[model samples]
Target: GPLGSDNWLPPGWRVEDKIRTSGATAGSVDKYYYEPNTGRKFRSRTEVLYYLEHGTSKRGTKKAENTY
Candidate 1:
């Protein structure tokens, strides 16, 4: 008998990948999202990592006032 592909999880780490993204889509928009309206290279994902850290309760207050 052969083990199909695989089935397992790390010791303590859990497969918490729930979100899917497309770097291509981001690039596509940046390339031609200004055909009708004016815009700059502005995107959260592009500017910084948009990773949704699991089991986190921390608020992003790095620049709270600036954000407001």
Candidate 2:
């Protein structure tokens, strides 16, 4: 199974439930998410979950302004 289904919001910071399709093809379908407020999208659920859990450390900028 994929990770993070049981995990909570990366978008739903006072958000809601609404998931859209990436595409009918398998390559894109499982590789995305829709942010409810801004309609921004992400290709990796792992990276998204990491942001919610760890404050954008995946980008490897160690300063305060460098982060986010």
Candidate 3:
């Protein structure tokens, strides 16, 4: 189906494989901030920016705005 006007999505917006440094993946979040607003597909899309996995989970990414 065609994404709506606000269906802004990054190129193949999908999570990449976890980075295995110590035989364990550090996990990763999409670099949406790196998405070019000039991309041909996103020109009309607003690229509704946002954070994916908030806060550090059992995963390991640090969380600064965790106000729960």
Candidate 4:
């Protein structure tokens, strides 16, 4: 199957999945979302969504208009 566009993400965004074989989270699958241009790695779905909407992490009080 092709890693094409997704309804949850904008065009060029990519999704990656990795299975953990070590650490406490062993046997768990970690899903990662990547920004196409910057190649920034998003650890969770909420993080990606936040970046898309707010253009910054939730910790920042100020909003960045052109982060993307």
What would the TM-score be for candidate 4 when compared with the true structure?
Answer: 0.60
Choose 1 or 4, whichever is better by lDDT. 4
In model 3, the Cα lDDT at residue 22 comes to 43
For lDDT, the strongest prediction is 4
lDDT of 1 by residue, 1-68 (tens): 72321123222322222233465543332211111122222133222222223322234656557643
lDDT of 2 by residue, 1-68 (tens): 63655256543643233444545643432435556555555556676676557654445555577645
Q: What is the lDDT of candidate 1?
A: 0.27
Model 3 TM-score, all chains together: 0.17
Listed in order, each prediction's TM-score against the native is 0.18, 0.32, 0.17, 0.60
* Higher-TM-score candidate of 2 and 4: 4
Q: List the residue pairs that clash in candidate 2.
A: none
**lDDT (tens digit, per residue) of candidate 4 on 1-68:** 85442457766887878787688758888778888676788877877877878876556466567765
Choose 3 or 4, whichever is better by TM-score. 4
Q: Which residues of candidate 4, in runs, are more than 4 Å off?
A: 1-6, 56-68
**lDDT (0 to 1) per candidate:** 0.27, 0.51, 0.33, 0.73
lDDT of 2: 0.51
